[PDB]
């Protein structure tokens, strides 16, 4: 028993159709290995200024006969400062025809995000606090845990196939792995955090030279680009020809010439012999105005986002605390086995 769910390549994010409630209200929501809560845009939400938060489906709790309020406030703040607020509830969630009952979700009534987010990370990373760090609700069973508990999948595990940069769709498989979609062997890597789906990144080879790393990297479907500690990003930037630009007061981004040579590749070395190679076009992000962001940016959190993950097949196993990785093979052939 596995559940395949199509991933829509939206550009900066990958989303899936998820139905919520007794009346199967279709939400198109970001699939996010970097967060752990599922929240939906209330039909009466007050989007942030300038934010079109209702064009990817909305949820009306009152037309779902099964919706229950939990009577606790929900607040989340993501790494880029994006926020959502609402209240916690429970309802039926349906993923490609498979329904789980009584799933805890948040009904969001204010958000700066364009659409809801289905966080599928560790329950230990749930956003159960207010903005001051005071807890408002207990940790709880998020979607992957409930899929296992209700007998829909055997293991809290999922495989991520974002597919190629030009692909319109990819696939996430809950409780299964598609052995047709990678070359070599899947290499199981130990997860290096109990809260974040991070594995040890030994080194990065950029423009032919190795740069020693040795620390954890978050394998985040919900991040567009790649983020490294400032000093390391700066060493890579100097090699790549990227420039840190203060785009507004105390706001910095790496830009790179849009005409930069992208013929090469950037190579990521992980444990146990695993290597993922990324084409260098993934590091020139067109802004659409003749300028380009570099695909690496500085952060106090190390993140390998979509520009990396498109080039790997990943089996995340939250019960075994391993993420198995291999160089992706783009194919519509499938050989899906349960995990």
């Amino acid at each position: 028993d596995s559940i395949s769910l199509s991933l829509i390549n939206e550009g900066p994010s990958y989303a899936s159709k998820v139905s919520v409630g007794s009346n199967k209200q279709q939400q198109t929501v970001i699939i996010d290995t970097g967060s752990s809560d599922f929240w939906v845009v209330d039909s009466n939400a007050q989007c942030g200024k300038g934010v079109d938060c209702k064009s990817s489906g909305t949820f009306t709790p009152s037309s779902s006969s099964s919706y229950k309020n939990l009577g606790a406030a929900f607040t989340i703040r993501y790494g880029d400062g994006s926020t959502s607020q609402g209240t916690w509830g429970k309802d039926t969630v349906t993923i490609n025809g498979v329904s789980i009952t009584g799933q805890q979700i948040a009904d969001v009534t204010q958000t700066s995000v364009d659409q809801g987010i289905l966080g599928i990370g560790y329950t230990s990373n749930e956003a159960v606090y207010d903005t001051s760090g005071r807890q408002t609700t207990p940790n709880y069973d998020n979607v992957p845990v409930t899929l296992k508990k209700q007998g829909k999948i055997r293991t809290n595990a999922y495989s991520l196939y974002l597919n190629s940069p030009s692909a319109e769709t990819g696939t996430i498989i809950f409780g299964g792995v598609d052995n047709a979609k990678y070359s070599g062997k899947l290499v199981a890597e130990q997860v290096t955090s109990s809260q974040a789906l991070t594995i040890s990144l030994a080194s990065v080879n950029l423009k032919g030279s190795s740069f020693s790393f040795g620390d954890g990297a978050l394998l985040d479907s919900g991040t567009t680009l790649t983020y490294f500690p400032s000093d390391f990003a700066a060493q890579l930037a100097d090699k790549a020809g990227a420039r840190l630009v203060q785009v507004a007061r105390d706001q910095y981004l790496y830009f790179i010439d849009c005409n930069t040579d992208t013929s090469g590749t950037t190579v990521f070395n992980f444990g146990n012999g695993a290597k993922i190679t990324v084409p260098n076009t993934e590091y020139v992000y067109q802004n659409g105005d003749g300028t380009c962001l570099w695909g690496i940016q500085p952060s106090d959190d190390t993140i390998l986002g979509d520009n990396f993950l498109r080039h790997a097949y990943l089996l995340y196993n939250l019960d075994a605390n391993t993420i198995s990785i291999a160089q992706v093979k783009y194919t519509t052939d499938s050989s899906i086995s349960a995990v």
Binding site: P12, S13, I30, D32, T33, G34, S35, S36, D37, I76, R77, Y78, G79, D80, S82, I117, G119, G121, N125, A127, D220, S221, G222, T223, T224, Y227, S299, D300, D301, I303, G305
Partner: peptide, 5 residues
């Protein structure tokens, strides 16, 4: 975008 820490 950068989705929770």
């Amino acid at each position: 975008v950068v989705f929770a820490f």
